[PDB]
Amino acid sequence: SGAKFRISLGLPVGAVINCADNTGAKNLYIISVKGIKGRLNRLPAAGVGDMVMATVKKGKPELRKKVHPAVVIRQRKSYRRKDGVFLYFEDNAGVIVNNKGEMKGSAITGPVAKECADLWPRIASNAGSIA
Protein backbone atom coordinates (compact mmCIF):
# COMPACT_ATOMS: atom_id res chain seq x y z
CA SER A 1 0.00 0.00 0.00
CA GLY A 2 1.89 3.01 1.32
CA ALA A 3 0.69 5.80 3.60
CA LYS A 4 1.14 9.55 3.27
CA PHE A 5 4.36 10.93 4.71
CA ARG A 6 4.33 13.91 7.04
CA ILE A 7 4.26 17.32 5.37
CA SER A 8 4.23 20.90 6.61
CA LEU A 9 0.64 21.84 7.37
CA GLY A 10 0.38 25.62 7.13
CA LEU A 11 -3.45 25.74 7.22
CA PRO A 12 -4.74 26.04 10.80
CA VAL A 13 -8.37 26.22 11.87
CA GLY A 14 -9.87 29.48 10.65
CA ALA A 15 -8.07 29.62 7.31
CA VAL A 16 -10.16 30.54 4.28
CA ILE A 17 -9.00 28.70 1.18
CA ASN A 18 -10.25 28.76 -2.39
CA CYS A 19 -12.85 26.27 -3.58
CA ALA A 20 -11.48 24.74 -6.75
CA ASP A 21 -14.52 22.76 -7.92
CA ASN A 22 -17.63 23.84 -9.82
CA THR A 23 -20.03 23.46 -6.88
CA GLY A 24 -20.70 27.21 -6.91
CA ALA A 25 -18.80 27.71 -3.66
CA LYS A 26 -16.10 30.35 -3.86
CA ASN A 27 -14.14 29.74 -0.66
CA LEU A 28 -13.90 27.23 2.17
CA TYR A 29 -13.50 28.25 5.81
CA ILE A 30 -11.69 25.48 7.68
CA ILE A 31 -13.28 24.77 11.06
CA SER A 32 -11.48 21.51 11.94
CA VAL A 33 -9.20 18.84 10.51
CA LYS A 34 -9.99 15.13 10.47
CA GLY A 35 -7.84 12.84 12.57
CA ILE A 36 -6.42 15.50 14.90
CA LYS A 37 -6.18 14.29 18.48
CA GLY A 38 -4.89 17.58 19.80
CA ARG A 39 -2.71 19.43 22.28
CA LEU A 40 -3.41 22.22 24.73
CA ASN A 41 -3.54 25.57 22.86
CA ARG A 42 -2.50 23.98 19.54
CA LEU A 43 -4.61 24.83 16.51
CA PRO A 44 -5.56 21.82 14.35
CA ALA A 45 -3.81 22.34 11.03
CA ALA A 46 -4.03 20.66 7.64
CA GLY A 47 -1.83 20.14 4.61
CA VAL A 48 -2.59 18.92 1.13
CA GLY A 49 -4.41 15.60 1.11
CA ASP A 50 -6.05 16.25 4.48
CA MET A 51 -9.79 15.93 5.00
CA VAL A 52 -11.21 18.98 6.77
CA MET A 53 -14.57 20.22 7.97
CA ALA A 54 -15.34 23.47 6.18
CA THR A 55 -18.14 25.97 5.70
CA VAL A 56 -18.37 28.16 2.62
CA LYS A 57 -18.45 31.85 3.49
CA LYS A 58 -19.29 33.11 0.01
CA GLY A 59 -20.91 31.20 -2.83
CA LYS A 60 -24.31 29.76 -3.61
CA PRO A 61 -26.75 30.41 -0.74
CA GLU A 62 -27.80 26.76 -0.45
CA LEU A 63 -24.27 25.76 0.60
CA ARG A 64 -23.46 28.56 3.03
CA LYS A 65 -24.81 27.83 6.50
CA LYS A 66 -23.71 24.18 6.60
CA VAL A 67 -20.66 22.09 7.45
CA HIS A 68 -19.05 20.30 4.52
CA PRO A 69 -16.24 17.76 4.37
CA ALA A 70 -13.44 19.01 2.17
CA VAL A 71 -9.97 17.95 1.06
CA VAL A 72 -7.04 20.33 0.63
CA ILE A 73 -5.58 20.04 -2.87
CA ARG A 74 -3.11 22.96 -2.97
CA GLN A 75 -1.25 24.92 -0.31
CA ARG A 76 0.98 27.99 -0.23
CA LYS A 77 3.25 26.54 2.46
CA SER A 78 6.32 24.76 1.11
CA TYR A 79 6.66 21.08 1.95
CA ARG A 80 9.38 18.50 1.40
CA ARG A 81 8.51 15.60 -0.90
CA LYS A 82 11.01 12.91 0.19
CA ASP A 83 13.31 13.62 -2.76
CA GLY A 84 14.58 17.01 -1.61
CA VAL A 85 11.92 18.90 -3.56
CA PHE A 86 10.39 21.77 -1.60
CA LEU A 87 7.15 22.50 -3.45
CA TYR A 88 4.58 25.22 -2.86
CA PHE A 89 1.56 26.44 -4.80
CA GLU A 90 0.31 29.88 -5.71
CA ASP A 91 -2.82 29.56 -3.56
CA ASN A 92 -4.51 27.38 -0.95
CA ALA A 93 -7.35 25.44 -2.54
CA GLY A 94 -9.69 22.61 -1.66
CA VAL A 95 -12.66 20.72 -3.04
CA ILE A 96 -15.89 19.70 -1.34
CA VAL A 97 -16.27 15.95 -0.89
CA ASN A 98 -18.44 13.61 1.17
CA ASN A 99 -17.34 11.30 3.96
CA LYS A 100 -16.68 8.53 1.42
CA GLY A 101 -14.23 10.80 -0.43
CA GLU A 102 -15.91 11.49 -3.77
CA MET A 103 -16.44 15.08 -4.80
CA LYS A 104 -19.72 16.95 -4.73
CA GLY A 105 -18.59 18.73 -7.90
CA SER A 106 -17.28 17.30 -11.14
CA ALA A 107 -14.26 19.38 -12.21
CA ILE A 108 -11.21 20.95 -10.57
CA THR A 109 -9.63 24.22 -11.66
CA GLY A 110 -5.86 24.29 -11.43
CA PRO A 111 -3.37 21.61 -10.41
CA VAL A 112 -3.78 19.06 -7.65
CA ALA A 113 -0.88 18.11 -5.41
CA LYS A 114 0.48 14.63 -6.03
CA GLU A 115 0.16 13.98 -2.30
CA CYS A 116 -3.58 14.63 -2.49
CA ALA A 117 -4.09 12.85 -5.82
CA ASP A 118 -2.58 9.55 -4.67
CA LEU A 119 -4.59 9.51 -1.45
CA TRP A 120 -7.98 10.38 -3.01
CA PRO A 121 -8.61 8.59 -6.33
CA ARG A 122 -11.98 10.31 -6.87
CA ILE A 123 -10.27 13.70 -6.64
CA ALA A 124 -7.45 12.54 -8.92
CA SER A 125 -9.85 11.62 -11.73
CA ASN A 126 -11.23 15.17 -11.94
CA ALA A 127 -7.78 16.77 -11.71
CA GLY A 128 -6.73 18.63 -14.84
CA SER A 129 -3.07 18.32 -13.85
CA ILE A 130 -1.16 16.71 -10.99
CA ALA A 131 1.76 18.72 -9.61
Partner: protein, 402 residues
Protein backbone atom coordinates in the same frame (compact mmCIF):
# COMPACT_ATOMS: atom_id res chain seq x y z
CA UNK B 1 -7.84 22.18 42.84
CA UNK B 2 -7.01 20.26 39.68
CA UNK B 3 -5.68 22.09 36.66
CA UNK B 4 -8.56 22.88 34.37
CA UNK B 5 -7.24 21.17 31.23
CA UNK B 6 -4.75 18.33 30.95
CA UNK B 7 -1.43 18.95 29.25
CA UNK B 8 1.69 16.79 29.00
CA UNK B 9 4.76 17.78 30.98
CA UNK B 10 7.42 20.03 29.44
CA UNK B 11 10.73 18.23 29.08
CA UNK B 12 11.99 14.92 30.40
CA UNK B 13 12.99 14.14 33.97
CA UNK B 14 15.35 11.44 32.69
CA UNK B 15 18.06 14.04 31.99
CA UNK B 16 17.57 16.08 35.15
CA UNK B 17 21.10 17.19 36.09
CA UNK B 18 20.82 19.65 33.21
CA UNK B 19 24.39 20.72 33.85
CA UNK B 20 27.61 21.11 31.93
CA UNK B 21 29.08 17.68 31.30
CA UNK B 22 32.03 16.86 33.54
CA UNK B 23 33.78 15.38 30.49
CA UNK B 24 34.51 16.62 26.99
CA UNK B 25 35.09 13.26 25.30
CA UNK B 26 31.88 11.39 26.01
CA UNK B 27 32.24 8.04 27.74
CA UNK B 28 30.65 4.77 26.66
CA UNK B 29 29.03 3.81 30.01
CA UNK B 30 27.85 0.48 28.56
CA UNK B 31 29.78 -1.81 26.29
CA UNK B 32 28.03 -4.55 24.30
CA UNK B 33 27.59 -7.73 26.29
CA UNK B 34 30.46 -10.11 25.64
CA UNK B 35 29.89 -13.62 24.31
CA UNK B 36 32.88 -15.94 23.78
CA UNK B 37 31.36 -17.58 20.69
CA UNK B 38 32.04 -14.48 18.59
CA UNK B 39 35.50 -13.74 17.21
CA UNK B 40 37.67 -11.22 19.02
CA UNK B 41 36.75 -7.67 18.04
CA UNK B 42 36.73 -4.09 19.26
CA UNK B 43 33.48 -2.45 20.30
CA UNK B 44 34.11 1.29 19.96
CA UNK B 45 36.05 4.00 18.14
CA UNK B 46 36.79 7.72 18.27
CA UNK B 47 35.94 10.16 15.49
CA UNK B 48 35.61 13.88 14.87
CA UNK B 49 32.51 15.64 13.56
CA UNK B 50 33.66 17.11 10.25
CA UNK B 51 30.35 18.34 8.88
CA UNK B 52 27.09 17.49 7.18
CA UNK B 53 25.93 17.00 3.62
CA UNK B 54 23.21 15.09 1.78
CA UNK B 55 23.13 12.14 -0.59
CA UNK B 56 20.85 10.60 -3.20
CA UNK B 57 20.08 6.89 -3.02
CA UNK B 58 17.43 4.41 -4.09
CA UNK B 59 15.30 2.82 -1.39
CA UNK B 60 14.62 -0.92 -1.27
CA UNK B 61 11.72 -0.88 1.22
CA UNK B 62 8.86 -3.03 -0.14
CA UNK B 63 5.34 -1.89 0.58
CA UNK B 64 6.45 1.73 0.97
CA UNK B 65 5.59 4.80 -1.08
CA UNK B 66 9.31 5.34 -1.69
CA UNK B 67 10.02 1.76 -2.78
CA UNK B 68 12.47 1.76 -5.71
CA UNK B 69 12.42 5.57 -5.58
CA UNK B 70 15.10 8.20 -5.13
CA UNK B 71 15.39 10.02 -1.82
CA UNK B 72 17.62 12.81 -0.53
CA UNK B 73 18.95 12.15 2.96
CA UNK B 74 21.14 14.28 5.19
CA UNK B 75 24.35 12.63 6.39
CA UNK B 76 27.08 13.48 8.89
CA UNK B 77 30.76 13.03 8.07
CA UNK B 78 32.92 11.80 10.96
CA UNK B 79 36.64 11.79 10.24
CA UNK B 80 38.16 8.64 11.76
CA UNK B 81 41.93 8.25 11.46
CA UNK B 82 43.21 4.91 12.78
CA UNK B 83 43.47 4.47 16.54
CA UNK B 84 46.79 3.50 18.11
CA UNK B 85 46.78 0.89 20.88
CA UNK B 86 49.14 1.78 23.73
CA UNK B 87 47.87 -0.25 26.69
CA UNK B 88 45.72 -3.02 28.11
CA UNK B 89 43.51 -2.87 31.21
CA UNK B 90 42.14 -5.93 33.00
CA UNK B 91 39.01 -5.82 35.14
CA UNK B 92 37.86 -8.34 37.75
CA UNK B 93 34.26 -8.87 38.83
CA UNK B 94 33.63 -8.13 42.51
CA UNK B 95 30.46 -7.99 44.62
CA UNK B 96 31.09 -4.24 44.61
CA UNK B 97 31.29 -3.99 40.80
CA UNK B 98 34.07 -4.15 38.27
CA UNK B 99 37.42 -2.95 39.59
CA UNK B 100 40.62 -2.25 37.71
CA UNK B 101 42.97 -5.16 38.28
CA UNK B 102 46.15 -4.42 36.33
CA UNK B 103 47.17 -2.00 33.58
CA UNK B 104 50.06 -2.69 31.20
CA UNK B 105 51.32 0.02 28.86
CA UNK B 106 53.27 -0.52 25.67
CA UNK B 107 56.76 0.67 24.97
CA UNK B 108 57.17 3.68 22.66
CA UNK B 109 54.10 5.69 23.58
CA UNK B 110 53.47 8.27 20.88
CA UNK B 111 54.39 11.89 21.47
CA UNK B 112 50.84 13.14 20.88
CA UNK B 113 49.56 10.48 23.28
CA UNK B 114 51.98 11.62 25.99
CA UNK B 115 50.59 15.15 25.67
CA UNK B 116 47.38 13.91 27.30
CA UNK B 117 49.26 13.38 30.57
CA UNK B 118 50.31 17.04 30.89
CA UNK B 119 48.34 20.18 31.64
CA UNK B 120 51.23 22.33 30.38
CA UNK B 121 53.14 20.42 27.71
CA UNK B 122 55.21 23.47 26.80
CA UNK B 123 56.91 23.74 30.20
CA UNK B 124 57.03 20.00 30.85
CA UNK B 125 60.21 17.95 30.87
CA UNK B 126 58.37 15.23 28.88
CA UNK B 127 59.23 12.66 31.54
CA UNK B 128 56.01 10.60 31.50
CA UNK B 129 56.42 6.82 31.07
CA UNK B 130 60.19 7.26 30.72
CA UNK B 131 61.03 4.99 33.65
CA UNK B 132 58.16 2.63 32.82
CA UNK B 133 59.39 1.96 29.29
CA UNK B 134 62.75 0.83 30.69
CA UNK B 135 61.12 -2.30 32.14
CA UNK B 136 60.30 -3.58 28.65
CA UNK B 137 64.04 -4.15 28.10
CA UNK B 138 65.67 -5.61 31.21
CA UNK B 139 64.94 -9.22 32.12
CA UNK B 140 63.75 -8.26 35.61
CA UNK B 141 61.12 -5.91 34.21
CA UNK B 142 60.19 -8.31 31.42
CA UNK B 143 59.53 -11.07 33.96
CA UNK B 144 57.29 -8.69 35.89
CA UNK B 145 55.39 -7.82 32.71
CA UNK B 146 54.77 -11.50 31.96
CA UNK B 147 53.39 -12.02 35.47
CA UNK B 148 51.07 -9.06 34.88
CA UNK B 149 49.82 -10.70 31.69
CA UNK B 150 49.47 -14.10 33.35
CA UNK B 151 47.62 -12.54 36.29
CA UNK B 152 45.27 -10.80 33.85
CA UNK B 153 44.76 -14.12 32.07
CA UNK B 154 43.76 -16.06 35.19
CA UNK B 155 41.89 -13.42 37.20
CA UNK B 156 40.34 -10.82 34.90
CA UNK B 157 36.88 -11.17 33.37
CA UNK B 158 36.78 -8.29 30.86
CA UNK B 159 39.81 -6.62 29.33
CA UNK B 160 40.04 -3.28 27.57
CA UNK B 161 42.69 -1.64 25.40
CA UNK B 162 43.82 1.95 25.76
CA UNK B 163 43.74 3.54 22.31
CA UNK B 164 44.40 7.11 21.26
CA UNK B 165 43.66 9.17 18.19
CA UNK B 166 46.21 10.84 15.93
CA UNK B 167 46.11 14.65 16.08
CA UNK B 168 48.90 15.06 13.53
CA UNK B 169 46.55 13.77 10.81
CA UNK B 170 43.72 16.20 11.56
CA UNK B 171 43.43 19.86 10.47
CA UNK B 172 42.69 20.88 14.04
CA UNK B 173 44.77 23.07 16.31
CA UNK B 174 44.71 20.53 19.12
CA UNK B 175 47.80 18.31 19.27
CA UNK B 176 46.73 16.49 22.45
CA UNK B 177 45.45 13.04 21.53
CA UNK B 178 42.27 11.56 22.99
CA UNK B 179 42.80 8.41 25.06
CA UNK B 180 40.05 5.86 25.46
CA UNK B 181 39.44 2.40 26.90
CA UNK B 182 37.80 0.22 24.24
CA UNK B 183 36.43 -3.09 25.46
CA UNK B 184 37.58 -6.25 23.68
CA UNK B 185 34.72 -8.69 23.15
CA UNK B 186 34.24 -12.11 21.65
CA UNK B 187 36.40 -14.83 23.14
CA UNK B 188 38.06 -16.24 26.19
CA UNK B 189 40.13 -13.92 28.36
CA UNK B 190 43.28 -15.69 27.21
CA UNK B 191 42.35 -15.18 23.55
CA UNK B 192 41.50 -11.50 23.89
CA UNK B 193 44.75 -10.88 25.78
CA UNK B 194 46.79 -12.55 23.05
CA UNK B 195 44.85 -10.57 20.46
CA UNK B 196 45.34 -7.29 22.32
CA UNK B 197 49.02 -7.95 23.01
CA UNK B 198 49.70 -8.27 19.28
CA UNK B 199 47.95 -4.95 18.66
CA UNK B 200 50.20 -3.07 21.09
CA UNK B 201 51.91 -0.11 19.37
CA UNK B 202 49.78 -0.86 16.28
CA UNK B 203 47.16 1.05 14.31
CA UNK B 204 43.54 -0.08 14.19
CA UNK B 205 41.62 1.42 11.23
CA UNK B 206 37.91 2.10 11.51
CA UNK B 207 36.95 -0.51 8.89
CA UNK B 208 38.24 -3.20 11.26
CA UNK B 209 35.84 -2.03 13.98
CA UNK B 210 32.69 -1.08 12.06
CA UNK B 211 31.20 -2.22 8.78
CA UNK B 212 29.04 -0.92 5.96
CA UNK B 213 25.29 -0.34 6.49
CA UNK B 214 25.26 -1.30 10.15
CA UNK B 215 23.64 0.77 12.88
CA UNK B 216 25.84 2.09 15.69
CA UNK B 217 25.44 4.38 18.69
CA UNK B 218 26.99 7.84 18.83
CA UNK B 219 28.14 9.17 22.20
CA UNK B 220 29.23 12.75 22.69
CA UNK B 221 28.62 16.15 24.21
CA UNK B 222 26.11 18.51 22.63
CA UNK B 223 26.68 22.11 21.58
CA UNK B 224 26.84 24.53 24.48
CA UNK B 225 24.24 27.27 24.59
CA UNK B 226 25.26 29.03 27.79
CA UNK B 227 22.88 30.18 30.49
CA UNK B 228 19.30 29.94 29.22
CA UNK B 229 15.84 30.76 30.49
CA UNK B 230 12.87 28.46 30.87
CA UNK B 231 11.41 29.26 27.44
CA UNK B 232 14.52 28.10 25.60
CA UNK B 233 15.71 25.49 28.11
CA UNK B 234 12.41 23.69 28.78
CA UNK B 235 10.30 25.08 25.92
CA UNK B 236 7.51 26.27 28.17
CA UNK B 237 4.70 28.50 26.94
CA UNK B 238 5.45 32.19 26.65
CA UNK B 239 3.30 34.38 28.88
CA UNK B 240 1.02 37.02 27.33
CA UNK B 241 2.32 40.39 26.20
CA UNK B 242 0.56 42.17 29.10
CA UNK B 243 2.68 40.42 31.75
CA UNK B 244 4.29 42.92 34.11
CA UNK B 245 7.60 41.53 35.35
CA UNK B 246 8.41 39.41 32.31
CA UNK B 247 6.84 36.87 29.98
CA UNK B 248 9.68 34.41 29.30
CA UNK B 249 9.03 32.76 32.65
CA UNK B 250 7.04 30.01 34.31
CA UNK B 251 4.09 31.64 36.04
CA UNK B 252 3.63 29.18 38.93
CA UNK B 253 6.65 27.30 40.28
CA UNK B 254 4.64 25.31 42.81
CA UNK B 255 1.64 25.27 45.08
CA UNK B 256 1.56 26.63 48.62
CA UNK B 257 2.24 23.11 49.84
CA UNK B 258 4.64 21.20 49.88
CA UNK B 259 6.09 24.70 50.74
CA UNK B 260 9.15 24.08 48.57
CA UNK B 261 10.10 24.26 44.91
CA UNK B 262 10.06 20.75 43.47
CA UNK B 263 12.89 19.34 41.38
CA UNK B 264 10.40 18.82 38.53
CA UNK B 265 9.66 22.52 37.94
CA UNK B 266 11.33 24.10 34.92
CA UNK B 267 13.97 26.64 35.93
CA UNK B 268 16.66 28.63 34.15
CA UNK B 269 20.30 27.64 33.96
CA UNK B 270 22.78 25.88 31.73
CA UNK B 271 21.57 24.68 28.34
CA UNK B 272 23.65 22.53 26.05
CA UNK B 273 27.01 20.87 26.59
CA UNK B 274 25.25 17.78 27.93
CA UNK B 275 26.45 14.22 27.56
CA UNK B 276 24.11 12.33 25.24
CA UNK B 277 23.91 8.87 23.68
CA UNK B 278 21.99 8.42 20.43
CA UNK B 279 21.41 4.87 19.22
CA UNK B 280 20.52 3.45 15.80
CA UNK B 281 22.70 5.56 13.51
CA UNK B 282 23.24 3.74 10.23
CA UNK B 283 26.62 3.78 8.49
CA UNK B 284 25.98 4.82 4.90
CA UNK B 285 29.65 4.77 3.89
CA UNK B 286 33.11 4.19 5.31
CA UNK B 287 35.39 6.43 3.29
CA UNK B 288 38.78 5.20 2.24
CA UNK B 289 40.96 8.29 2.76
CA UNK B 290 43.73 9.82 0.69
CA UNK B 291 46.38 7.59 -0.86
CA UNK B 292 49.56 8.13 -2.86
CA UNK B 293 50.54 5.29 -5.17
CA UNK B 294 51.75 7.47 -8.04
CA UNK B 295 49.46 10.46 -7.55
CA UNK B 296 47.05 11.51 -4.84
CA UNK B 297 43.77 9.58 -4.93
CA UNK B 298 40.64 11.43 -3.83
CA UNK B 299 38.00 9.68 -5.94
CA UNK B 300 37.49 6.98 -3.30
CA UNK B 301 35.76 9.51 -1.02
CA UNK B 302 32.79 10.87 -2.98
CA UNK B 303 32.58 8.96 -6.27
CA UNK B 304 29.79 6.38 -6.34
CA UNK B 305 28.96 3.51 -8.67
CA UNK B 306 26.75 5.93 -10.63
CA UNK B 307 28.71 9.20 -10.39
CA UNK B 308 32.28 8.28 -11.44
CA UNK B 309 33.45 11.81 -10.66
CA UNK B 310 36.99 12.29 -9.33
CA UNK B 311 35.98 14.21 -6.22
CA UNK B 312 36.51 13.81 -2.49
CA UNK B 313 34.04 14.15 0.37
CA UNK B 314 35.30 17.69 0.98
CA UNK B 315 32.86 20.39 -0.17
CA UNK B 316 33.90 23.13 -2.52
CA UNK B 317 35.96 25.50 -0.40
CA UNK B 318 36.34 22.97 2.42
CA UNK B 319 34.23 21.94 5.37
CA UNK B 320 33.05 25.09 7.12
CA UNK B 321 34.68 25.62 10.53
CA UNK B 322 36.44 22.26 10.31
CA UNK B 323 39.12 22.02 7.65
CA UNK B 324 39.88 19.39 5.04
CA UNK B 325 39.11 15.70 5.52
CA UNK B 326 41.98 13.51 4.33
CA UNK B 327 41.73 10.38 6.49
CA UNK B 328 39.14 7.62 6.72
CA UNK B 329 35.64 8.81 7.47
CA UNK B 330 32.30 7.32 8.44
CA UNK B 331 29.19 8.66 6.71
CA UNK B 332 26.44 8.41 9.31
CA UNK B 333 22.79 8.96 8.47
CA UNK B 334 21.21 12.05 9.99
CA UNK B 335 22.42 14.46 12.64
CA UNK B 336 24.91 13.88 15.45
CA UNK B 337 25.38 15.72 18.75
CA UNK B 338 28.17 18.25 19.12
CA UNK B 339 29.73 21.15 17.28
CA UNK B 340 32.11 20.82 14.37
CA UNK B 341 35.44 19.10 15.17
CA UNK B 342 33.84 17.73 18.34
CA UNK B 343 35.23 14.35 19.34
CA UNK B 344 32.59 11.63 19.09
CA UNK B 345 32.47 8.10 20.43
CA UNK B 346 31.09 5.46 18.08
CA UNK B 347 29.88 2.34 19.85
CA UNK B 348 28.55 -0.99 18.63
CA UNK B 349 24.81 -1.37 19.14
CA UNK B 350 23.72 -2.95 22.41
CA UNK B 351 20.58 -4.27 20.69
CA UNK B 352 19.94 -6.99 18.13
CA UNK B 353 19.19 -5.40 14.77
CA UNK B 354 16.35 -7.34 13.15
CA UNK B 355 13.96 -4.71 11.79
CA UNK B 356 13.93 -3.88 8.09
CA UNK B 357 15.18 -0.35 8.79
CA UNK B 358 18.33 -2.10 9.97
CA UNK B 359 19.98 -4.83 7.86
CA UNK B 360 19.10 -2.80 4.75
CA UNK B 361 21.72 -2.51 2.03
CA UNK B 362 22.71 1.10 1.34
CA UNK B 363 23.78 1.90 -2.23
CA UNK B 364 24.62 5.56 -2.84
CA UNK B 365 23.91 7.19 -6.19
CA UNK B 366 25.12 10.73 -5.50
CA UNK B 367 27.03 12.62 -2.82
CA UNK B 368 26.62 16.38 -2.66
CA UNK B 369 29.86 18.37 -2.57
CA UNK B 370 28.60 21.88 -3.23
CA UNK B 371 30.02 24.67 -1.11
CA UNK B 372 28.43 24.82 2.32
CA UNK B 373 29.91 28.30 2.89
CA UNK B 374 26.92 29.87 1.16
CA UNK B 375 24.45 28.76 -1.48
CA UNK B 376 26.94 26.69 -3.40
CA UNK B 377 25.84 25.58 -6.85
CA UNK B 378 28.84 23.64 -8.22
CA UNK B 379 29.97 20.15 -7.29
CA UNK B 380 33.63 20.46 -8.33
CA UNK B 381 36.18 23.07 -9.34
CA UNK B 382 36.34 21.70 -12.88
CA UNK B 383 32.57 21.90 -13.32
CA UNK B 384 32.63 25.53 -12.15
CA UNK B 385 35.46 26.50 -14.50
CA UNK B 386 33.76 24.76 -17.41
CA UNK B 387 30.49 26.59 -16.76
CA UNK B 388 31.84 30.10 -16.29
CA UNK B 389 34.73 29.95 -18.74
CA UNK B 390 37.83 32.08 -18.30
CA UNK B 391 37.61 35.04 -15.94
CA UNK B 392 39.50 38.32 -15.70
CA UNK B 393 41.98 37.01 -13.14
CA UNK B 394 42.64 34.01 -15.38
CA UNK B 395 43.35 36.36 -18.29
CA UNK B 396 45.80 38.53 -16.35
CA UNK B 397 47.46 35.38 -15.00
CA UNK B 398 47.68 33.81 -18.46
CA UNK B 399 49.07 37.12 -19.72
CA UNK B 400 51.88 36.72 -17.18
CA UNK B 401 51.99 32.97 -17.88
CA UNK B 402 52.65 33.53 -21.61
Amino acid sequence: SHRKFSAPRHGSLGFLPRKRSSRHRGKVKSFPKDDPSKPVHLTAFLGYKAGMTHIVREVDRPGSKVNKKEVVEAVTIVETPPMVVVGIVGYVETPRGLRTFKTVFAEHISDECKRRFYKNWHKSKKKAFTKYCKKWQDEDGKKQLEKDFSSMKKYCQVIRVIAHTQMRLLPLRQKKAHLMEIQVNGGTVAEKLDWARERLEQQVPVNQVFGQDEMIDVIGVTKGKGYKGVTSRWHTKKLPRKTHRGLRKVACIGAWHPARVAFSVARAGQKGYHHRTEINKKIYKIGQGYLIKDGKLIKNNASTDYDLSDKSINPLGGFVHYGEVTNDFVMLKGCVVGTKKRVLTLRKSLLVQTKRRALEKIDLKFIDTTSKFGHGRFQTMEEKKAFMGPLKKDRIAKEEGA
